[PDB]
Amino acid sequence: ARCLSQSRNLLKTTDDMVKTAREKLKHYSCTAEDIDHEDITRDQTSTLKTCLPLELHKNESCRGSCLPPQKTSLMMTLCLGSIYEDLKMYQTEFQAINAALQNHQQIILDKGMLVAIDELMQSLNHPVGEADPYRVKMKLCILLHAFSTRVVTINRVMGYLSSA
Amino acid sequence: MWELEKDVYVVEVDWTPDAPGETVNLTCDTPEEDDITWTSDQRHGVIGSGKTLTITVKEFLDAGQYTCHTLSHSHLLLHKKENGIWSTEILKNFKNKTFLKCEAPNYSGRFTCSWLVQRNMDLKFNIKSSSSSPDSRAVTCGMASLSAEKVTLDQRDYEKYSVSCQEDVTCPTAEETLPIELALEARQQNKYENYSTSFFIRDIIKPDPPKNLQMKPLKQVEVSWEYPDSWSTPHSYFSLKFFVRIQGCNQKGAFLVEKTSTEVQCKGGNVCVQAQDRYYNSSCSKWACVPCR
Numbered sequence: 037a038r039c040l041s042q043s044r045n046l047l048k049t050t051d052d053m054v055k056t057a058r059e060k061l062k063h064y065s066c067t068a069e070d071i072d073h074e075d076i077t078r079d080q081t082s083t084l085k086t087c088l089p090l091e092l093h094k095n096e097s098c099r100g101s102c103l104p105p106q107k108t109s110l111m112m113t114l115c116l117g118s119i120y121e122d123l124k125m126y127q128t129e130f131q132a133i134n135a136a137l138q139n140h141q142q143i144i145l146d147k148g149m150l151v152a153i154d155e156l157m158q159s160l161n162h163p164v165g166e167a168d169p170y171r172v173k174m175k176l177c178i179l180l181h182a183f184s185t186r187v188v189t190i191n192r193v194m195g196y197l198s199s200a
Numbered sequence: 201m202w203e204l205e206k207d208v209y210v211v212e213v214d215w216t217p218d219a220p221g222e223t224v225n226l227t228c229d230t231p232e233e234d235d236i237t238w239t240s241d242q243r244h245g246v247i248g249s250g251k252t253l254t255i256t257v258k259e260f261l262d263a264g265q266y267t268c269h270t271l272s273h274s275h276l277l278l279h280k281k282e283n284g285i286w287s288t289e290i291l292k293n294f295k296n297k298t299f300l301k302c303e304a305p306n307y308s309g310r311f312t313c314s315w316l317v318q319r320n321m322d323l324k325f326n327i328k329s330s331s332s333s334p335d336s337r338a339v340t341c342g343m344a345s346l347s348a349e350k351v352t353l354d355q356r357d358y359e360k361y362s363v364s365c366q367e368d369v370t371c372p373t374a375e376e377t378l379p380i381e382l383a384l385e386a387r388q389q390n391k392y393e394n395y396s397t398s399f400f401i402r403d404i405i406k407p408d409p410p411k412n413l414q415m416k417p418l419k420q421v422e423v424s425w426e427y428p429d430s431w432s433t434p435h436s437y438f439s440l441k442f443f444v445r446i447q448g449c450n451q452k453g454a455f456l457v458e459k460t461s462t463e464v465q466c467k468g469g470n471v472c473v474q475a476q477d478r479y480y481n482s483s484c485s486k487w488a489c490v491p492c493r
């Protein structure tokens with residue numbers, strides 16, 4: 037338990053970070069939401085298949101100190117493990133984007149969000165593409181929108197682990 | 201000329217005064233009969249003689265219900281393209297300018313899309329999933345029904361149609377990878393248009409109003425509500441947030457409570473509660489107001 041506060045803070049640090057994005061990066065299709073939802077963990081993630089409550093699994097055909105000691109499930113263990121790999125993947129991308137952004141003004145990545153993904157990664161644990169100035173801004177926005185949806189999934193899981 | 205239905209055809213016209221209308225022949229659906237006559241629903245008398253009747257379609261008068269003489273029927277529909285863009289005249293947009301407003305009360309897969317009609321005569325609607333690609337979510341929709349509740353916008357009231365849709369239930373996923381791509385075909389008399397939309401359930405979630413709103417006097421009152429029954433379960437996973445005000449997502453003079461209850465201070469006032477997804481900044485519920493003693 038207690039990993040809920042870290043997921044909530046990650047939700048807060050991400051939301052006010054995307055607010056910093058769609059504000060500074062105006063007219064970049066960032067606020068327009070026309071940017072395609074691009075999952076960067078799609079190749080090696082089991083989050084969407086496993087991070088679901090056991091009540092929804094009605095058909096047979098379908099570590100870290102965050103899992104509740106009262107209820108242990110292999111599917112929930114896979115969920116927490118996949119969440120860790122997702123955060124690490126986003127950490128490496130964000131750190132690389134931040135290097136290019138720090139040199140070139142309009143946008144800067146929140147240090148609170150960067151330390152929030154790491155503190156939640158540690159509780160779960162118990163090389164980057166090439167882009168030009170205009171393109172590195174677009175990439176950050178596409179990542180932030182997908183990262184917001186992923187943190188929402190993490191918060192649903194952590195809320196489900198607590199109080200149940 | 202492309203085939204929308206067996207005896208209903210749609211012809212696309214450049215809708216430019218100099219452009220020549222497309223010339224396409226239509227024959228009577230009876231093969232062996234000879235010495236027939238032809239009429240149109242916009243003409244009084246006979247206008248054809250042969251077993252096959254050529255036609256040049258530049259204007260709306262050149263379209264209609266062409267009936268043999270009653271051996272068979274054929275219908276012509278026009279889809280205007282003006283300067284390369286297709287007409288959007290049958291439907292009326294909302295203030296958002298979206299022509300299709302979809303919303304889901306939960307994450308089950310059910311959702312309803314609604315649209316406004318400028319002018320409600322001889323309207324036929326057909327909505328379906330717009331992508332046949334294998335990597336595409338399948339959605340089956342029912343038939344469209346007119347709503348007794350009209351909609352007002354820009355000092356004018358419009359009639360509203362809606363349809364209930366349901367994603368073909370697969371094994372559950374925690375997120376949505378690909379968007380739901382729908383397409384609507386609208387058919388005013390002798391006019392064809394089609395409108396399309398793409399959305400994620402996570403963005404169309406509009407929670408139903410809170411239920412069982414009660415209040416108990418405190419030292420200062422404790423206002424208590426309950427999650428909507430239409431909302432997804434488990435409520436622990438599908439957490440909701442609640443905005444409360446005393447007297448979408450307006451939240452003017454309103455405060456947030458992530459629990460089913462809070463303690464407010466009011467005299468002779470009316471307390472209101474709305475709901476929303478606790479994590480995704482989706483649409484907010486309608487207000488469930490109640491007076492405060």
Ligand SMILES: *[C@@H]1O[C@H](CO)[C@@H](O[C@@H]2O[C@H](CO)[C@@H](O[C@@H]3O[C@H](CO)[C@@H](O)[C@H](O)[C@@H]3O)[C@H](O)[C@H]2NC(C)=O)[C@H](O)[C@H]1NC(C)=O
Pocket residue numbers: 201202203212279330383394396
């Ligand atoms: C929305 O409206 C547009 C324009 O009316 C539709 O596009 C048209 O769709 C029809 C039927 O799919 C096409 O007919 C086909 O044309 C090909 C041309 O080679 C022919 O080989 C086929 O036998 C058939 O007759 C038509 O070409 C096409 N026109 C354009 C300009 O794209 C569209 O299908 C409607 N629906 C959606 C979801 O967009």
Ligand SMILES: *[C@@H]1O[C@H](CO)[C@@H](O)[C@H](O)[C@H]1NC(C)=O
Pocket residue numbers: 094095098369370371372
């Ligand atoms: C469970 O199996 C039944 C029967 O095969 C099927 O109708 C239903 O859609 C399945 N549910 C899921 C979530 O796959």
